[PDB]
Enzyme design. Structure first.
Site, short mmCIF file in Angstrom:
data_model
loop_
_atom_site.label_atom_id
_atom_site.label_comp_id
_atom_site.label_asym_id
_atom_site.label_seq_id
_atom_site.Cartn_x
_atom_site.Cartn_y
_atom_site.Cartn_z
N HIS A 67 -3.38 6.95 3.69
CA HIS A 67 -3.82 5.69 3.11
C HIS A 67 -4.87 5.04 4.00
CE1 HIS A 67 -3.89 1.77 1.13
NE2 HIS A 67 -3.80 1.24 2.33
N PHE B 201 -10.18 -5.29 1.49
CA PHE B 201 -9.43 -5.08 0.24
C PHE B 201 -10.34 -4.99 -0.99
CE2 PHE B 201 -5.74 -7.34 2.49
CZ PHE B 201 -5.15 -6.14 2.85
N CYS C 188 0.79 -1.22 0.00
CA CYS C 188 0.00 0.00 0.00
C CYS C 188 0.83 1.28 0.00
CB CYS C 188 -0.94 -0.01 1.20
SG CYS C 188 -1.86 -1.54 1.35
N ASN D 41 -10.27 -0.43 0.84
CA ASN D 41 -8.81 -0.37 0.87
C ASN D 41 -8.28 -0.93 -0.45
OD1 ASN D 41 -6.04 -0.67 1.31
ND2 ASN D 41 -6.25 -1.58 3.36
C1 LIG Z 1 -11.37 -5.32 10.58
C2 LIG Z 1 -11.46 -3.82 10.92
C3 LIG Z 1 -12.86 -3.34 10.68
C4 LIG Z 1 -11.07 -3.60 12.41
O1 LIG Z 1 -12.21 -3.85 13.25
P1 LIG Z 1 -12.16 -3.32 14.84
O2 LIG Z 1 -12.30 -1.80 14.88
O3 LIG Z 1 -10.83 -3.72 15.47
O4 LIG Z 1 -13.45 -4.03 15.72
P2 LIG Z 1 -13.21 -5.09 17.02
O5 LIG Z 1 -12.01 -4.64 17.84
O6 LIG Z 1 -14.43 -5.10 17.90
O7 LIG Z 1 -12.92 -6.62 16.44
C5 LIG Z 1 -13.91 -7.22 15.60
C6 LIG Z 1 -13.50 -8.67 15.30
O8 LIG Z 1 -12.61 -8.70 14.35
C7 LIG Z 1 -11.29 -9.52 14.93
N1 LIG Z 1 -10.10 -8.99 14.37
C8 LIG Z 1 -9.89 -7.69 14.12
N2 LIG Z 1 -8.65 -7.55 13.58
C9 LIG Z 1 -8.10 -8.78 13.50
C10 LIG Z 1 -6.87 -9.22 13.03
N3 LIG Z 1 -5.67 -8.50 12.44
N4 LIG Z 1 -6.57 -10.51 13.07
C11 LIG Z 1 -7.47 -11.41 13.56
N5 LIG Z 1 -8.68 -10.99 14.02
C12 LIG Z 1 -8.99 -9.67 13.99
C13 LIG Z 1 -11.30 -9.33 16.24
O9 LIG Z 1 -10.60 -10.41 16.93
C14 LIG Z 1 -12.82 -9.32 16.59
O10 LIG Z 1 -13.29 -10.56 16.77
P3 LIG Z 1 -14.68 -10.75 17.68
O11 LIG Z 1 -15.75 -9.82 17.16
O12 LIG Z 1 -15.16 -12.17 17.57
O13 LIG Z 1 -14.39 -10.42 19.12
C15 LIG Z 1 -10.51 -3.04 10.04
O14 LIG Z 1 -10.70 -1.68 10.25
C16 LIG Z 1 -9.06 -3.40 10.38
O15 LIG Z 1 -8.81 -4.44 10.89
N6 LIG Z 1 -7.98 -2.45 10.08
C17 LIG Z 1 -6.55 -2.79 10.41
C18 LIG Z 1 -6.10 -4.00 9.54
C19 LIG Z 1 -4.69 -3.74 9.01
O16 LIG Z 1 -3.75 -4.25 9.56
N7 LIG Z 1 -4.49 -2.88 7.83
C20 LIG Z 1 -3.13 -2.63 7.32
C21 LIG Z 1 -3.06 -3.06 5.79
S1 LIG Z 1 -3.15 -1.57 4.74
#
Ligand SMILES: CC(C)(COP(=O)(O)OP(=O)(O)OC[C@H]1O[C@@H](n2cnc3c(N)ncnc32)[C@H](O)[C@@H]1OP(=O)(O)O)[C@@H](O)C(=O)NCCC(=O)NCCS
Ligand SMILES: CC(C)(COP(=O)(O)OP(=O)(O)OC[C@H]1O[C@@H](n2cnc3c(N)ncnc32)[C@H](O)[C@@H]1OP(=O)(O)O)[C@@H](O)C(=O)NCCC(=O)NCCS
Lengths: 375, 363
Positions: free
Chosen positions: B276, B201, B149, B309
């Site tokens: 990003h 993605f 990215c 994304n």
């Molecule tokens: C998925 C996303 C919506 C995050 O959600 P969030 O704000 O953390 O919401 P929550 O903390 O309540 O977690 C929601 C669920 O997703 C799971 N989860 C979130 N991120 C995870 C990860 N990297 N790996 C495994 N599980 C994950 C959580 O364990 C959780 O499980 P549960 O509902 O059964 O308890 C998204 O915004 C995200 O993950 N962004 C970061 C990902 C990343 O690394 N991007 C970099 C690449 S450019």
């Protein structure tokens, strides 16, 4: 000259290869034996003839018979072996690049902390993060070393790294120092013999492994660093309607290289042009990517060159084979070392102006205008 | 000094509204009996702040290439054959629009930088683009493969030095394309990293022309975050690309780029921002640590909402949205009426690309 002072220069060069040597005289027997194809007699004779006229004497290779025995799909045509090739290359490509880069940095004579940029080139494996990052990690480069990763550009990647390095070095100033590292491991594209795919047979006679590193910078500190060559200019051109000359298809069975019979004539006919379009023809030095003996010969015949003009390129072809990306840097190193051992006036065999040619899929030609430094 | 002279974007035509996507994803992969996994995926989609995504991979493309939808099945050749053709075609749609805005002949370009992490071939996507666009043989190509990215920002960093060191006739076309054909994976309860990537993605292409204006490229610098290698990992395999996303990535990223702002710039609401859209938490960290008002991140939030994304090309989408809305809403500069700005790309490493920008006056 102020002209030479302001312009990007090569500050160090060094090379590395895997330890296992394969002499070409024995390679047909070994190649057809580890791929268990000894019954393709007509094919072996054709491949024998291929290695004999390849003007290659020895090649260095990571892929030994023991590594084929541990990853036996690599030796079985059409078999799924991409994951096995990837695991090896993602580990070994940066390691061998470290061996060459450590030697180049030793020649440059400055600390790691004075590097500002890293350009890594390879067509052997792909990963995220990529081999540029992995090299930076296992060398302990500072976090501020700015990385550029050149994947899958074939045999013009070494030349293209210099084109990029020249503009980076000159536009950011005398602090800027670029480390260039080019590595190739033929684990990526080794294929077992077959009479259906005659275009793959040639590649197993020429392709080999090696790594070359270089430092590039402009505005040199007049007490620690001295240039070996100045990068005067660097331009890429593409030959129209030639896309099927060199073709690389990355597949579940590894990479499938296709080499057209006419590539050396088309390349040779074009780089002779570039020479003329860009510049007596024995009064300049030459670094030609040893794609095959026919390219080096056409330079000699069409330009009327003495035997010594192409000697460093014939040399690297004989001792190392076609190493793709890093090969032009092996020849640059071989030219300057013999120039100094034989006490010649300049690092370019006693001459002032010189040209470097990389080429590969496209067809793409990279032309680097060089100039010696007085010895 | 190097400037952006034009920007345009393209996306595959098929829209996937996020509200429908857990149902769709588990249906086409024949995994709907994995009901607890599906409820976890629903919660991920519902927290993503993504409203819709454009995607090449439709149900029909999965049916034509069934192994793409079967976890661990060999599907690399099928993915490769789609992407080697479709990546440059999508890039062409964006590049033609960028050249049109520019107003100069296609033949006036001197350089092409192509960026994609979707497919690899020799010759590469940059050649194929030049071929299907009819770029003249003198256009000098550079291929940026698999940089995640930060590829879009990295192309600006290279384009700045190429444009500035070669003169005024030098004109660089930048084209960034991503297709999630590369990394689509069926759900598994023991590989939760895929669940994240399948929620976020998406597909898109962006094109920009650089020469030495809409924004001026003041400087660009790459840095790497120590001891973060395992945060964003991409493993290209016979089953396609297998990605691994650490849950702590948004916090490592967000703390780092907040710090990059501080070190680089020497009131935070008085500059503009392109971040990003890695996910909502990175954007919310910028707003909170810098005390940013709500309109600062509006363009970055908007692209996340409407495109997801898209990896490499995302920052160019945000740059385009910012200057477009700046003009239409009567702001005084291309950067929302502000003078200085910053663009942040980031990806595997962890690697951060920081581009200092400056706006130009409009009405
Ligand atoms: C998925 C996303 C919506 C995050 O959600 P969030 O704000 O953390 O919401 P929550 O903390 O309540 O977690 C929601 C669920 O997703 C799971 N989860 C979130 N991120 C995870 C990860 N990297 N790996 C495994 N599980 C994950 C959580 O364990 C959780 O499980 P549960 O509902 O059964 O308890 C998204 O915004 C995200 O993950 N962004 C970061 C990902 C990343 O690394 N991007 C970099 C690449 S450019
Ligand atoms: C050994 C080599 C280096 C030189 O061979 P050569 O002497 O010029 O070619 P010859 O006509 O003498 O014979 C080579 C044999 O291999 C065959 N052959 C040569 N090139 C071939 C090709 N691209 N595809 C299929 N078959 C080929 C020839 O048909 C011939 O077969 P035969 O003599 O048994 O009937 C050969 O491998 C070669 O030149 N390859 C091309 C190099 C190249 O394209 N590099 C790309 C730059 S990265």
């Amino acid at each position: 000259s102020k002209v030479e002072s302001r312009q990007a220069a090569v500050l160090a060069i060094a090379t590395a290869n895997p330890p296992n040597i394969f002499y070409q005289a024995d390679y047909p027997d070994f190649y057809f034996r580890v791929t268990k194809s000894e019954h393709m007699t007509q094919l072996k004779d054709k491949f024998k003839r291929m290695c004999e006229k390849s003007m290659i004497r020895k090649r260095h290779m990571y892929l030994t018979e023991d590594v084929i025995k541990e990853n036996p799909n690599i030796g079985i045509l059409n078999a799924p072996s991409f994951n096995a090739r990837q695991e090896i290359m993602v580990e070994e490509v940066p390691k061998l690049g470290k061996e060459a880069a450590l030697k180049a940095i030793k020649e440059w004579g400055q600390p790691l902390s004075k590097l500002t940029h890293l350009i890594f080139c390879t067509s052997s494996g792909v990963n995220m993060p990529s081999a540029d990052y992995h090299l930076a990690k296992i060398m302990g480069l500072p976090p501020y070393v700015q990385r550029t990763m050149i994947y899958q550009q074939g045999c013009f990647a070494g030349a293209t790294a210099l084109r990029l390095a020249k503009d980076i070095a000159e536009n950011n100033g005398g602090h800027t120092r670029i480390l260039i590292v080019c590595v190739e491991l033929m684990v990526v594209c080794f294929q077992a013999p077959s009479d259906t795919y005659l275009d793959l047979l040639v590649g197993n006679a020429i392709f080999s492994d090696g790594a070359a590193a270089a430092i590039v910078g402009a505005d040199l500190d007049t007490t620690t660093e001295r240039p070996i060559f100045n990068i005067v200019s660097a331009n890429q051109t593409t030959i129209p309607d030639s896309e099927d000359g060199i073709v690389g298809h990355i597949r579940e069975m590894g990479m499938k290289y296709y080499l057209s019979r006419t590539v050396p004539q088309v390349i040779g006919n074009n780089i002779v042009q570039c020479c003329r379009d860009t510049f007596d023809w024995n009064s300049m030095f030459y670094i030609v990517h040893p794609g095959g003996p026919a390219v080096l010969r056409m330079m000699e015949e069409k330009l009327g060159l003495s035997k010594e003009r192409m000697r460093a390129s014939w040399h690297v072809l004989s001792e190392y084979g076609n190493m793709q990306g890093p090969s032009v840097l092996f020849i640059l190193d071989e030219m300057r070392n013999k120039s100094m051992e034989e006490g010649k006036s300049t690092t370019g065999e006693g001459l002032e102006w010189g040209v470097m040619f990389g080429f590969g899929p496209g067809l793409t030609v990279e032309t680097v205008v060089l100039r010696s430094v007085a010895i």
